[PDB]
Structure formats: structure tokens, C-alpha cells
Write a protein that binds this ligand. Structure first.
Ligand SMILES: CC#C[C@]1(O)CC[C@H]2[C@@H]3CCC4=CC(=O)CCC4=C3[C@@H](c3ccc(N(C)C)cc3)C[C@@]21C
Ligand SMILES: CC#C[C@]1(O)CC[C@H]2[C@@H]3CCC4=CC(=O)CCC4=C3[C@@H](c3ccc(N(C)C)cc3)C[C@@]21C
Ligand SMILES: CC(=O)[C@H]1CC[C@H]2[C@@H]3CCC4=CC(=O)CC[C@]4(C)[C@H]3CC[C@]12C
Length: 251
């Protein structure tokens, strides 16, 4: 309580932005865009793992819970942070994958996943509409890691549930700082948690494309780096068996 707030810790451990290493002089083509996003995903994946290990409460989970949460959440976390970066850097008009890999209309079209790009942009436009604050975002991003679990339950169910309640309490703390009335805070919590819930449907779409391009990678000439291959190969069978379920705030 005089302890450093959870928010101050989340601010301290928030990763720095990852560069794609993209050559912007190349023409916009499907396999160079998709292979480059996968190379970016590989670098963001090490960032995410490092961030997750520092997240207060996370290391108290069983190691199999930790790995499972990561497998189930990586796409959503990266998609959610992209919504944030697109909001802060382009007011939701473009997809800010990295400072050196920004998608405009032409690149979204050449990516072969135009509709999904639009999905991702709609998330960014909801950040813009709510004017999400940095403190809200960081709490929401933690909660997103804790929002897809095994149907069978986790090995550390009590520790997980306590951790989830602590991050929800911190999101409400971040909201109440603006010093609005209580009813306004309720509304804000509702809007932010709707935004979180809306990630699940987007992610399902993103997963469908990713899994397809993964299975067809040779024929499409779309490169998947080693760690991405590992996490997709692990996740794909569990999703197929329907082992994961979303934890929704709203029915
Ligand atoms: C209708 C139909 C059809 C299909 O021809 C079979 C699977 C489709 C694929 C599935 C999974 C899929 C998911 C999407 O969300 C957008 C499109 C999509 C497709 C299609 C597609 C077309 C081109 C690529 N490239 C070049 C990487 C990738 C996917 C159309 C696909 C191939
Ligand atoms: C082979 C294999 C495998 C996997 O089970 C799927 C994805 C792996 C992930 C890749 C992406 C990845 C990137 C890293 O930087 C270190 C580890 C790592 C992993 C794995 C992993 C192991 C332990 C944790 N903890 C305890 C937080 C987190 C991640 C091993 C993963 C999950
Ligand atoms: C090549 C491919 O299948 C695409 C479809 C969805 C794409 C991901 C969409 C979410 C995303 C956000 C980032 O900021 C890193 C790149 C990623 C992680 C994208 C990597 C390439 C993906 C996985």
C-alpha cells in the first residue's frame, strides 16, 4: 500500500519498441510483406516472453501454466500493442507494426489479408475513440495475457485467479485517477472491458490466416522463423482440439 504500485512496475518493465529490419525500398509484395511481419513477430516474441516473466504474479504460476498462457495469448498481445502503437503514432489511420514497417492502404491490400488489416485498424480506432491512457493500456495488456485459459483449468488455479483480480483492481485504480464520478468510472470500465473482449474474435481470424500460411508456407514461400514455428506447432493442435476458452467480461 506504501508498496510501489503495480502500475509503476508495469511502466518500468514495458518493452522498448522493436524494429522490423525491413527494407522499404523493396516493392510491396505479398511474400516479402508476410515474411517480414514473421521476422518482426519473432523479435516481439522474445520481448513478450521477457515482459511476461517480470509481470508480478506470473512466475508464481506453474511453469506449464506460464507456457500455456503464452501459447494462447501471443497473437492477441501483439495485436493489442499494435492497436496501441497505431493509435499513438498515426491516430489509427495506419498499422504501425514497427517504426520501419508501417502499413498504408496499398500494403494492406498487397498483404493478402486486407479484411484482417481492417479488423486490426478497427481496434486502433476504438483506442482513439476512448482516448485510452498509458496506465489503462498497460493494465489491459496484462489482463489480455490472463484471458485465454485451458477448459480443463490451470495447475495453479488459485494463484491465477488472485493475479487476475489484482490486475482488474489495478485497472479500476488507473481509471479512478482521472477523478471522475463513480458512474463515469463504471462506464469507463465497461468500455475498456468491451475493447478487451473484442480481441478474441479478431484473434480467431488472425489465427486462421496464420495457421493456413504456416501449413502452406513452402508453396507460398512465406518464411516462419524458428521460435514462431515452435509456438505455432505447439498451439495448433490444442486449438484444433478446442482446449482453450476465452475468459469474457461480458456475456
Ligand atoms: C474462399 C477460399 C479460399 C482459399 O483459396 C483456400 C483457403 C483460403 C485462405 C484460408 C484462410 C484465409 C483467411 C483469411 O482471413 C483471409 C484469406 C484466407 C485464405 C485465402 C488466401 C488467399 C491468399 C493467401 N496468400 C497469398 C498468402 C492466403 C490466403 C483464400 C484461400 C487460399
Ligand atoms: C520447443 C518449444 C516450445 C514452447 O513450448 C512453445 C513456444 C516456446 C516459446 C517460443 C518463444 C520463446 C522465446 C524466448 O525468448 C525464451 C523461451 C520461448 C518459448 C518457451 C518458453 C519456455 C518457458 C517460458 N516461461 C517459463 C515463461 C516461456 C516460453 C518454450 C515455448 C513456450
Ligand atoms: C504471416 C501471417 O500469418 C500473419 C497473419 C497475422 C500476422 C500477425 C498480426 C499481429 C502482429 C502484430 C505485430 O506487431 C508483430 C506482427 C504480428 C504478430 C503479425 C505477424 C504475421 C501474421 C501472423
Amino acid at each position: 500500500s506504501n508498496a510501489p504500485s503495480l502500475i509503476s512496475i508495469l511502466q518500468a518493465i514495458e518493452p522498448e519498441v522493436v524494429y522490423a529490419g525491413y527494407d522499404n525500398t523493396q516493392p510491396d509484395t505479398t511474400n516479402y510483406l508476410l515474411s517480414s511481419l514473421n521476422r518482426l513477430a519473432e523479435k516481439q516474441l522474445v520481448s513478450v516472453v521477457k515482459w511476461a516473466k517480470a509481470l508480478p504474479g506470473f512466475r508464481n504460476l506453474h511453469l506449464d501454466d506460464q507456457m500455456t498462457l503464452i501459447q494462447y495469448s501471443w497473437m492477441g498481445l501483439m495485436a493489442f500493442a499494435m492497436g496501441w502503437r497505431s493509435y499513438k503514432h498515426t491516430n489509427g489511420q495506419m498499422l504501425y507494426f514497427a517504426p520501419d514497417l508501417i502499413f498504408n492502404e496499398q500494403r494492406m491490400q498487397q498483404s493478402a489479408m486486407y479484411d484482417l488489416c481492417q479488423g486490426m485498424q478497427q481496434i486502433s480506432q476504438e483506442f482513439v475513440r476512448l482516448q485510452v491512457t498509458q496506465e489503462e493500456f498497460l493494465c489491459m495488456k496484462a489482463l489480455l495475457l490472463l484471458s485465454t485459459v485451458p477448459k480443463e483449468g490451470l495447475k495453479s488455479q488459485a494463484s491465477f485467479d488472485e493475479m487476475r483480480m489484482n490486475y482488474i483492481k489495478e485497472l479500476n485504480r488507473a481509471i479512478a485517477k482521472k477523478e471522475n464520478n463513480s458512474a463515469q468510472n463504471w462506464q469507463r470500465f465497461y468500455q475498456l472491458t468491451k475493447l478487451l473482449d473484442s480481441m478474441h474474435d479478431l484473434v480467431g481470424g488472425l489465427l486462421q490466416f496464420c495457421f493456413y500460411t504456416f501449413v502452406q508456407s513452402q508453396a507460398l514461400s512465406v518464411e516462419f522463423p524458428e521460435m514462431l514455428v515452435e509456438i505455432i506447432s505447439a498451439q495448433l493442435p490444442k486449438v484444433l482440439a478446442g482446449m482453450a476458452k476465452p475468459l469474457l467480461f461480458h456475456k
